[PDB]
């Protein structure tokens, strides 16, 4: 119904901190919810949730509401929270003395920990009631609250300290930049790989068997540009998974699929060349068209058994508190695995291809200077392994360290290393498609 | 920066002998394949004999050892001995080298050709 400028600022405050959903969803304990955390019912009936929603909105929503309708529900929750604050002898004196911006910070805390929870901050509250902003900020920065949710606590505390919305303005700008940056990464992956796939598809002289292996690489790198990297970017710019527990588990398995198919194909290409460059005449008398396709179908078969089988069977799940907290939270899509899956998948996806590629490309060049007595072939070796190593080894070292000592690998670092590997899907078409009949092919496609 | 220089052609009667010489001027990568290709009018291009820098060779099936290809290490030069020649061998012969400096794909240098015609 009736909205205000103060009303709307609190709304946009918590859309950043908690998120907005215009369709009915489930909360951490399975209850139907909509808007910004508005509980519809505890009943295990979607139609029951819809009737409660329709009575509250005043329209036949069928589970789908608008933003303005979400603010109607939200301002009712704010009204209720304020109404209980004034009934609380611990919170009413502080609330009565605060300006509108800092009242929003206090309401934000109540939405996160409950009225009773926030009323336990008696010393911070005394300091806020006396307008001792910097002392209250220091004190709040030592809280259990701060150590549990550092990012949200920093934004709320900044709001208390300054009485401005600067923390939330800085978040919107940060995300918007990462949105453009990752949107660029997405299309470099897509364009570079869709350009390779059709160049093979329509040019008759590019159907070699070494290029038969390359378009399996480019197609594994293409699914990642279309499905894995985009939905991976929503987690970074929003701090949450927005697409439900089921798509979390499907997205996760598609991620480990494409990366397993991609890296193992780099391994097949690695030995393919060797087998073709050291003994070319045996090579053709050994690798038929069926055998070449036999390898790629095996790679994708191995990749499926590393990705969809164990993840859908829940063979990967850890058994700790943050493991179970994330499994119950449909907004958390962290890949909290156990030690055996973390190690087994890393060996199949990355470690055995790394050391096979390291061995193959090494024997290529020792048997090169066995006849010269050049480095334009060494520097090609240098980057084929150099780019592949810098993109994926930082992540799988951190992956195995985290699998033994969780506290050593912070999430930020862990997510950055994974994005280094994501960038390899854009680097590979640049690396493995530089033949004169690739170069002359791409020119023909875009002219 | 690297060109193939080829010699040894001409005309000979049936059951004759020639030795071909192909010098690969300039420096190129150490793993490679030197070989020979021919194409008669009407027919289309065809391998006859190739040799790898390690030593592995491969002859066509129009050659029952009558032709023997061989390199000469320390020199980018491959030779092809043509013995027991039949009138079916009239074709322009081409010297080819498979360069492997780029590791993902082949690089092909071509000699321009030497005519070979045989009479019965
Ligand atoms: C050539 C490649 C295969 C070598 C890479 C080997 C990697 C996997 C090795 C090198 C250093 C190793 C780590 C060194 C120290 C520790 C702490 C220990 O208390 C648990 C294992 C752990 C975390 C090791 C895990 C495996 C490890 C990361
Ligand atoms: C969901 C989320 C949240 C924060 C940051 C990143 C992500 C995305 C995630 C971690 C799922 N990417 C999966 C990653 O590409 C990956 C691929 C193949 C694998 O074999 C493994 C693997 O992860 C570790 C592992 O042991 N196995
Ligand atoms: O159990 C946690 C917390 O849940 C409620 O907090 C918020 C909710 O998280 C917000 O998203 C927002 O939508 O309003 C909710 C309150 O209805 C409770 O405030 C709180 O009692 C509880 O601890
Ligand atoms: O857990 C106490 C410790 O965690 C608190 O976090 C709460 C959370 O905020 C609520 O959602 C609740 O349901 O679960 C957690 C406890 O169950 C605070 O996060 C923190 O400052 C506090 O010290
Ligand atoms: C090369 C590509 C690198 C971009 C990857 C950006 C990941 C960023 O470090 O993530 C931190 C976020 O988790 C904060 O939540
Ligand atoms: Na989850």
TrEMBL record, chain A:
The primary location reported for this protein is host cell
List the signal peptide residues: none
A GO molecular function annotation here is: lysozyme activity
Q: What class of enzyme is it?
A: hydrolase
> Which compartment or compartments is the protein found in?
Host cytoplasm
Q: What EC number(s) are associated with this protein in UniProt?
A: 3.2.1.17
- Active site residues per record: 18 (proton donor/acceptor), 27 (proton donor/acceptor)
Q: Which family does it belong to?
A: Belongs to the glycosyl hydrolase 24 family.
Main role? Endolysin with lysozyme activity that degrades host peptidoglycans and participates with the holin and spanin proteins in the sequential events which lead to the programmed host cell lysis releasing the mature viral particles. Once the holin has permeabilized the host cell membrane, the endolysin can reach the periplasm and break down the peptidoglycan layer.
Supply the HAMAP family for this chain.
ENDOLYSIN_T4
Q: What is this protein called?
A: Endolysin
Species for this entry = Enterobacteria phage T4
What gene is this protein translated from? e
